[PDB]
Amino acid sequence: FTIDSARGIFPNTLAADVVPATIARFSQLNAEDQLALIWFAYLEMGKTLTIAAPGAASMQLAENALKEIQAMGPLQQTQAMCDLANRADTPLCRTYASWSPNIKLGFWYRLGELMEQGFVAPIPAGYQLSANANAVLATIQGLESGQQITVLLNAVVDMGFTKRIAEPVVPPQDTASRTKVSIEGVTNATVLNYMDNLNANDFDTLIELFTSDGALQPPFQRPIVGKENVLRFFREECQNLKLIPERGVTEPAEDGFTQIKVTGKVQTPWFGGNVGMNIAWRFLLNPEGKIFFVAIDLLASPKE
Amino acid sequence: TIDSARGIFPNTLAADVVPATIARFSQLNAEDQLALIWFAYLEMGKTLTIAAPGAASMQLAENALKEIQAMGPLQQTQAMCDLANRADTPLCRTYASWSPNIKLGFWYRLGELMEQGFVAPIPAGYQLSANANAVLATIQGLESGQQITVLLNAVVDMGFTKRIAEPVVPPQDTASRTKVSIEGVTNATVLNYMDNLNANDFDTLIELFTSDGALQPPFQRPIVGKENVLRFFREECQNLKLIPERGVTEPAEDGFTQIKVTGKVQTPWFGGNVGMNIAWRFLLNPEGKIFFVAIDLLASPKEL
Numbered sequence A: 001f002t003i004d005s006a007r008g009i010f011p012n013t014l015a016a017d018v019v020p021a022t023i024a025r026f027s028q029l030n031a032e033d034q035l036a037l038i039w040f041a042y043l044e045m046g047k048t049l050t051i052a053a054p055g056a057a058s059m060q061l062a063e064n065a066l067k068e069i070q071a072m073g074p075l076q077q078t079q080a081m082c083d084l085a086n087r088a089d090t091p092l093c094r095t096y097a098s099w100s101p102n103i104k105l106g107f108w109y110r111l112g113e114l115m116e117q118g119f120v121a122p123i124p125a126g127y128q129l130s131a132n133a134n135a136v137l138a139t140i141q142g143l144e145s146g147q148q149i150t151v152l153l154n155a156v157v158d159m160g161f162t163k164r165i166a167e168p169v170v171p172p173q174d175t176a177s178r179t180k181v182s183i184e185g186v187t188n189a190t191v192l193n194y195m196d197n198l199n200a201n202d203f204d205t206l207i208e209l210f211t212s213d214g215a216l217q218p219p220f221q222r223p224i225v226g227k228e229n230v231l232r233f234f235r236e237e238c239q240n241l242k243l244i245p246e247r248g249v250t251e252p253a254e255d256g257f258t259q260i261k262v263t264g265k266v267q268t269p270w271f272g273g274n275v276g277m278n279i280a281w282r283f284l285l286n287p288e289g290k291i292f293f294v295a296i297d298l299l300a301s302p303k304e
Numbered sequence B: 001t002i003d004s005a006r007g008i009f010p011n012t013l014a015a016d017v018v019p020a021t022i023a024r025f026s027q028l029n030a031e032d033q034l035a036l037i038w039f040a041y042l043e044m045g046k047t048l049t050i051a052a053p054g055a056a057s058m059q060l061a062e063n064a065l066k067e068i069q070a071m072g073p074l075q076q077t078q079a080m081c082d083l084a085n086r087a088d089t090p091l092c093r094t095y096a097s098w099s100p101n102i103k104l105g106f107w108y109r110l111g112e113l114m115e116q117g118f119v120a121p122i123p124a125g126y127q128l129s130a131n132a133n134a135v136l137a138t139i140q141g142l143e144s145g146q147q148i149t150v151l152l153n154a155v156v157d158m159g160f161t162k163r164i165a166e167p168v169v170p171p172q173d174t175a176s177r178t179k180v181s182i183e184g185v186t187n188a189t190v191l192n193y194m195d196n197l198n199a200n201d202f203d204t205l206i207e208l209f210t211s212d213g214a215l216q217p218p219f220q221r222p223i224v225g226k227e228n229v230l231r232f233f234r235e236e237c238q239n240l241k242l243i244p245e246r247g248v249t250e251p252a253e254d255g256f257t258q259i260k261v262t263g264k265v266q267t268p269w270f271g272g273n274v275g276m277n278i279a280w281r282f283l284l285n286p287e288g289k290i291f292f293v294a295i296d297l298l299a300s301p302k303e304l
C-alpha cells in the first residue's frame, strides 16, 4: 500500500472540515473584503485572546518589507496589501511567498499594530462587508477558538505569489528539563518518543523515528514525504509546540504494520495555554516500529 | 485593476457553498472520493441523464481508456485512485492535459463500464467515512445546478500538472440566430455578448473585449487578455444556452459603466433538464468594450 492509501486509516475520525470549507469561501471574496474581514475578526478576537509577540529574528527578517510599506503613501499601502491578498505577481508578493508561516504572521501582526495606531492605511471608517463576506465572518465567529485561529493562519499563509526564509532553529530542550507525556491505553515507544521529542524541539531525534520514505500530514494539507522534507517542515514550522495527548487506541494493520490513533490537545506558541486545539494523531508504524505515515487532524469538536 | 473590479455589485449572493463543498470533498481519502461520486452519479441518474460525450472527445480519450480497461482489477482501482490523489504518473499527466469536456467524457465511459462490471467497480456494500457521508449529504441538498458544478470541479481537479481540446464547432449560420431580450437592458455590448456566445461565434465575441480585458468564470480567478479568453471560449464554452432575464445599469469610475444581469444558463451536458441560476457582472469602458465580466452561480433562485 501507498502513503496516499494510508490517508484512509481511522476513516471515521471526525475532522473539522468546516475549516477548509470556510477558507475556500473566504478565498472567493474581493481582496478589500478579505482584508476588512480579517481586520474585523482580529479586532473582536483580540478582546479576549492576545497574540504572542513575534520573535526578534522573525521581525528582523520581515523588517525591510515592512519599512517599504510604511514608506508608501496611503493609497499605495492599501494597494500593496490588496496585492498580497490577490496573490498578484509583484516583488513584495514574491518576497512574502518566500517566508515561513511565522514570518508572514509576524509581518501582519506589525501591520495590525500600525493600522490600530493610524500609521498605515487602515480599513476605511464605517466599512461594510459584502453579502458573502458577512456570512463568512459569521461562520468564523461561530467556530471553536482553535478552528478560528487555523482559519486565520491559512488565510495569512495563502497570500503572496509563488528560496525559503525561516527563523533560526532553537536548541533542543536540555535532557534533564524534559517532561514525558502519558497516554491512556498507549505505551507504544515510537508514539511516546514522537510526542516527547517534539515537545523538546528535538527534531534530529524525532526524524529518526521515520521510515526513509515516511510522511507526515499536517491538518488539511497533503502529506509531506521523505525525511528531508519532513525534517525541513519540523525546523521551519514546528518549534515550541506543546502536545498534550490524552488517550489512544492501537490496532493491527496490513503487512504486519500497526495503526494507532491518539487524541488530545495542542497549544501553539502564538497563544500559549489560551487556545487548546482538539487534535487527533493517526500513526501507521511498520513492523520495526518506524513511522511510515502520521496524520495530524484538527477535530470537529471536543465530542470528537 | 482587474482584481479591484472583482468587487463590483459586491452584494451579489454567490453560491459559495459550491467551493466550500469542493474543499471538503478534496480532503477525503481517494477511495471515498471515488465512491462518493459513484453514489452521487447513480442517484442523480435516476432523474437526470447526462448527454453522451462527443465523438471527437471520445477519440481523444480512447487510448487512456483502453489502457485502463486492459489492466487487471486491482491496477484499475489504483489508476483511478492516482487520478483522485493527483499523483504524478503518465496517465495523470495525460488527464491533466485534457479540457474539462474530455475529462468528463473519460469518466462518463468508465461509469458505464463500472455499471456493466467490465472495469473494477466500487466494492459491494461500501460505506463512506464520517466526513464523506456528510459531504454527500451536503451535495444532495443543493440545487441541481450546484450539484453538477460540484461534480464538474471534482472531475477537473483530478490528475497531475500541452493542451488537448475538442475541435471548434463552426458558428451558427446568421439567418438561424435568435436574439436575447433582457428587461431593463438595451446595452449593445451586453446583448452582443449573449447573442454571440449563444451562436458559438467566438471571433466576434472576443472583439467586444478590451485588449487587457478579463473574464471570470464561477469560482475561478480572472482569465486575462484576449489570447487567454479566446482560448477559454474555444476549449470550454461551446454549445451553451444563455437565457438572461433582467438587469440593472449604473455608472462606474472613470466614465465606465457597470451592468449586472441575472438569468439562467444551460450546459449541453444536461440541455434543458438543468437551468443554473447565473449573474453576469460587466464593467464596460467609455467606448463600450468589456474590461471585465464575471459570471457567478447564484446561491438560490432568490438571488435572481
Ligand SMILES: CC1=C(/C=C/C(C)=C/C=C/C(C)=C/C=C/C=C(C)/C=C/C=C(C)/C=C/C2=C(C)C(=O)CCC2(C)C)C(C)(C)CCC1
Residues within 6 Å of the ligand: A035, A036, A038, A039, A042, A051, A105, A108, A109, A111, A112, A113, A115, A149, A150, A152, A153, A156, A198, A217, A218, A219, A237, A238, A241, A243, A266, A268, A270, A277, A279, A281, A296
Ligand atoms: C492578515 C491581516 C491582519 C493580521 C492578521 C493576524 C496578525 C493574524 C494572526 C493569526 C495567528 C497568530 C494565528 C496562529 C495560528 C497557529 C496555529 C493554528 C498553529 C497550529 C499548530 C498545530 C495544530 C501544530 C500541530 C502539529 C502537530 C501537533 C504534530 O504532531 C506535528 C507538527 C504539526 C502538524 C505542526 C490584519 C489584522 C492586520 C488585517 C489585514 C490582514
Ligand SMILES: CC1=C(/C=C/C(C)=C/C=C/C(C)=C/C=C/C=C(C)/C=C/C=C(C)/C=C/C2=C(C)C(=O)CCC2(C)C)C(C)(C)CCC1
Residues within 6 Å of the ligand: B034, B035, B037, B038, B041, B050, B104, B107, B108, B110, B111, B112, B114, B148, B149, B151, B152, B155, B197, B216, B217, B218, B236, B237, B240, B242, B265, B267, B269, B276, B278, B280, B295
Ligand atoms: C468522476 C467519477 C465518475 C463519473 C462522474 C461523471 C461522469 C460526472 C459528470 C458530470 C458532468 C457531466 C457535469 C457537467 C457540468 C457542467 C457545468 C456545471 C457547466 C456549467 C457552465 C456554465 C455555468 C458556463 C457559464 C459561462 C457563461 C454563461 C458565460 O457567459 C461565459 C462562459 C462561461 C463562464 C463558461 C464515476 C461515476 C465513474 C465514479 C468515479 C469517479
